[model samples]
Target chain A: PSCGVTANAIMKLFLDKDGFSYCFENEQTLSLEQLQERLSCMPECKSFVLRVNDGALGHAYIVDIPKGENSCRPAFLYQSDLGEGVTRKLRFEDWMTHKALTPILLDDICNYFSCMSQNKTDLEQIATLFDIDGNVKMLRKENIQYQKHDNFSFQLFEYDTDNIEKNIEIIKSLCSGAAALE
Target chain B: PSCGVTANAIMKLFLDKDGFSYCFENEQTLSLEQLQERLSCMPECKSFVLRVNDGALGHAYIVDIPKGENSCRPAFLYQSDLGEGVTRKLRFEDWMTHKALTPILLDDICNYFSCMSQNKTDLEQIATLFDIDGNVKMLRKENIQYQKHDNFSFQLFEYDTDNIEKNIEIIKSLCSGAAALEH
Candidate 1:
């Protein structure tokens, strides 16, 4: 007899105060070991994504790295939508291209293709991005709409790629297979 | 032709969180000035009262002190009684010695004496003393009342006798009849 395997994933996008787009994954069904291995091996993920696992579903975010030693801590990660149709995911690849890629767009395409294989529908879960002054203009059907709560605000910021790389390494080590860790 | 002299004085007391009292006098009437000067110069007055010219008719507790070198400047002095009690003419001297002087029987003396002094009362005022928690307890006509305005209060403290003497000297110099340069 074969065991039943079902994959579920949801994407949420938002616009932050600084005109940046934030992408988040919720209800990701992945075992702790699988999640850890993917994060540890995937050098393409420029932003930190959070994962919440309940043996049912999980969540993740492409967030800004925190300052100092806390850059490694997932709690300080952030995803921002700066409204004018710009996303941190797009910016991350743009950043990667400056490091050597002839066309940064290829990096984005590769990431999208890889995510698609995992049954992740980027088009269905894309979020609307807003401006620094909180003006929402650019809208996408793939993005989920969320009411901004007072305590949970997405702050947009710039960071050094070197620092980003270091933080990503730290996160991979700490949370990659957190779901499987007993 | 005789010109009548009318003096209007305003006195304010500040109680800091650290249990220290500072007094300021401004354009005082003879009664208030005399009272402050007496307190400042009295050797028995371990605490010296500081006086400045009063710009208003009533009194207040300092809410904001002037910033910088003049940071001791006072802000928001009280005057009205909002069902709690009035905030005027606080007495620091009585607060210091009242317990040791009268104890149980002193209440009658304070009450009777306060009532009698009403006729001689130069100002309708409230006498406040600060409790340990920095609450203002108004001693009006010998009965104690609480003030709602938390910012205003009184502080009782002890100082070296020499410091008291030095302050007395300073008060005497400023208020001395000879030094009374009414400039």
Candidate 2:
């Protein structure tokens, strides 16, 4: 099955700050495997991913910093758009938290730079491609449009959880029923 | 002419933190074209790319983050890595300043998660792959590392100073040596 617990957690961020805010707000950073197990046991917290313009953000997902923050929510990722497949992993940490595994568009990253997160901001640096003085011997903006297309999105699904620890119990229970191996 | 401007930018990140922190201090952020231009203009920033032992962080160059900030310097990139020729772009942002076209690695991203910037962390959901319950359902790290012949290491070079507006002059001179295009 797909998944439950879906929400439209859009991107917002502070002026010049950084983070994995969109990630789950759990007390302990759950590893993928652990997350899967937890999902299986609770029948909640299904596997989820970020889909951008009809495609999964692949690895770059958006994050909304925890409450009480000043930053606007913004999506983060390595590369976006241009139709590339990424072997994305959830950005993890020592304290037990991580960056959500999602994807975004290369163009969006640029747009963010061009618009919001202006000075020292998100991963879109095409601002570099511009002339140092913004004249760019040759460049155009009239041709550019602020029109949003399929744009950023989100998705969720059942994790098909696996609890390694309880595996023996399942096996034992099944052994009792012959079809238990099944 | 390879390049002689090399610096020992040993990575000082935590087991979980991320980076190759000497790439940015030279000037402002460089665009791929700008960086390439910078590389050509000075000949100092060349001969610098991180080489991982028997691993695959190749074609991966290093970069430093600006100081006094929360973000630790990280080596970011792309893979599109499986193909014999993986085209990687180091992720860059325009800070009002940023260097575009630098790729990032999933590993560096992870190290960034594992080490510095600890608080509101979220990504490591895959941590369960470690067998926290202690049972060999399946794994690899063991048969992998001790046999390591090659590994990740730093390579820094002098990014000879190049001004942005002045850069056009160099381009214009090239063109002037044009209109030199007939050759």
Candidate 3:
């Protein structure tokens, strides 16, 4: 799916600091396969990649700097909002110093830059953040609004936890076929 | 290209530690777009990804655990050789402890886990590894091989540095057209 944009985002998030960032424009699109091939064929080294759009928080960019030396860094693959990529070598630090990103955006982006341990204990604490359904519960506020409609009117319905499923099916049928009101 | 292999490789490298590794099989292929979209729409937090199958070694996996607290980790998108992805919750530590990887492979993989400072000083040292052509010169050795050919044979070749280009072109033309035997 026109992966050039996502590919470029990955480069910007990682190699930009090394002055190796490049973009894959419309005509210059680098398919995911091509990018993957290029990346695979590259010199074996550690690289970093950032996933900009997603829920949940943890590893900022993938790759671990296991405590040691005589080692290497990583490269990354990203999928972001911005496309029509270009190739420019700029340092992420300089990118910020130059004031190219907004404060809020920078703050959010930087938040993921920090790395963490994924050991059993760390994973246990992380598990606490998800609900029984395996989805992370986000703290947010929602409002229920009621508007009068000329087509039809309905009153407050009864509440029965036991028949919730059965009742839901009946209510759903009312909105379909002959049961629906004009 | 079929990116399932690469993508699964990324998952195995990163999330495998937390029992979140998965494989995107041929049929279950997640286009880079799909993977990127899924990643972008994820909760805002730190995530990691690994890029295997490349030369030179550094940032084993991407993402930095900057020195701080109340922060999160990351997820990753990879491209590797093993595809036919499967969604499994196997810890990476266990994967290794269980002997899924060879010792040499493990050593090579672990070398990248160490994160280094990308500050100007660090970048300078990295620069030293590359040649004037901007390619990182790998430390290797090559042995010249000589074999007799049935089609034709030639005597000791003349060595002329200045005429190398011109002489090479003439030799290339002979190989292409009639000046010699069948190619």
**Most accurate candidate by TM-score:** 2
Using Cα atoms, each model's DockQ against the true complex is: 0.00, 0.01, 0.01
- Arranged by lDDT with the best first, the candidates are 1, 2, 3
Worst 10 residues of 3 chain B by lDDT: B149-158
The CA lDDT at A36 in model 2 is: 34
For candidate 1, the docking band is incorrect
For candidate 2, write residues A5-75 as lDDT tens digits.
01111111111011122222321333223433532343222322222221222223322211121122233
User: How does residue A157 of candidate 2 score in lDDT?
Assistant: 27
Put down candidate 2 lDDT per residue, B35-85, tens digits, no spaces.
334333433223222312122222232243211222333342211112122
Q: Could you tell me the C-alpha RMSD of candidate 1 in Å?
A: 27.6
For all predictions in the order shown, the interface RMSD in Å is 36.9, 30.6, 32.2
> Where is model 1 more than 4 Å wrong at Cα?
A1-182, B1-62, B68-74, B77-82, B87-183
| TM-score, cand. 3 | 0.15
Chain B TM-score, all predictions listed? 0.23, 0.28, 0.21
